[PDB]
Amino acid sequence: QFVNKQFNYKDPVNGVDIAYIKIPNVQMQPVKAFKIHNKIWVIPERDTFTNPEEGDLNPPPEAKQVPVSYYDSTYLSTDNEKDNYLKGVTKLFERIYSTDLGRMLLTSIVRGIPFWGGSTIDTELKVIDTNCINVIQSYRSEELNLVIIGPSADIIQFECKSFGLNLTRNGYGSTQYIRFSPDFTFGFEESLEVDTNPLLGAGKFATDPAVTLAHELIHAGHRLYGIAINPNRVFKVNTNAYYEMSGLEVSFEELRTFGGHDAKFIDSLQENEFRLYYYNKFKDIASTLNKAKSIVGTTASLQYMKNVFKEKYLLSEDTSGKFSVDKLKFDKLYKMLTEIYTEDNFVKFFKVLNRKTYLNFDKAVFKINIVPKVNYTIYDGFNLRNTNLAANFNGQNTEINNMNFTKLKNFTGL
Ligand SMILES: *SCCCCCC(=O)NO
């Protein structure tokens, strides 16, 4: 069991795993937060904190808005919504952990401690302060890897924010703040030709939000190991005439995260270039660890932190105590994080209906309520065993299971 406490939003603060917290630096008032697992926290609040550019929840000027956007400044403003948000997110982590692939991914994420690259002197290993949160009581700072937070103004923009050396792309990693909601999901079409056409389909089938969360956690895995691909390296889509009409550009990072046939649109040569780039980053980390002869702070010993990063990066260690990067082990970890952890593989483990490509067109956004077990379960999602929803993905079929879905906006035609 991944989350061994059944938190309620109104549970009293204890300063340990239910607490008021602040983000170092950041303006922000303390927010009630919940530690659901080692290194992983949930803040059931709309994100007005991580980006100074984004404090308001009202829509920007309409000329500013993308077509696939959805605003509702009232969402997640009440205690009952935050209770259901917290319970919904924990339920989705348990659904992910109930699969072997999700257990692997979540183990990688917990082991993926952001590197202690904060020192200005080679002989000292030091934390980077923005990979911590401040737990209020006086305050005490504590390292963490992942925070799930409510969305900012655009509810369906599930961006990842972090503070930063380009930490998500230099091998170091940084604490990831994932904007996410378990209370909404997207509709897609069961025919591929319809799903990849911007003019057709109303969104008959609903994405299982466990797949959406797993998709975001895959990105967070890349980012915590500092191997995310530069967002400006993109596929200028020439396989979908409507992508080419609209000139839609999709980053290699997305195509990698979806996996399946999409990842083959990254050419072998540019993939080798990324692989060599990140291999060299891991070598620099080994070199940094070898120069460090003392540790800064009171939380852990030098030899404990060297071993934490040996385990994170799969470093080899010679009989003199010196670390190095073995290409066979680097390739195994890199492939694990980039080719084994993919959306397409999660669909296989969950046995759900899902989009077949990232290169489609979104159809609709639905309100959902996955907290009741009569609606959704850790092991079956919407497709509840021993009911009329168990077969043929009937629980994801928004026409059969219509009481579980409220369509809020249509995107077809926009
Ligand atoms: S977690 C990295 C940014 C995620 C942006 C939303 C997304 O994953 N869309 O496919």
Ligand SMILES: [Zn+2]
């Ligand atoms: Zn993505």
